[PDB]
Design a protein around this nucleic acid. Structure first.
Length: 48
DNA sequence: GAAGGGGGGCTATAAAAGGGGGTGGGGGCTCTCTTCCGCATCGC
């Protein structure tokens, strides 16, 4: 359960349903370098 | 009328002369998020 509970917590820790796509994982306030390694490498870095 | 023959032009070589023309080189598939438009609603 702890593995399942951890995934659900990360998807709801910010008070809204956060998808595990780029639209939810890159929107969270992480560093641009982490975001660029996931998806949208240049668009993420251009915005930063 | 086919085929061989004869005569003559073409080829290159130099050189001069002067001008026209030829040649080459410049120039005028699916899912998700964002944006725009029409509508009905109130407000003044």
């Amino acid at each position: 359960y702890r593995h399942l509970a951890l995934l659900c917590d990360t998807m709801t820790c910010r008070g809204h349903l956060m998808a595990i796509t780029r639209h939810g994982v890159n929107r969270q306030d992480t560093g641009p370098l982490m975001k660029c390694s996931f998806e949208e490498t240049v668009d993420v870095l251009m915005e930063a």
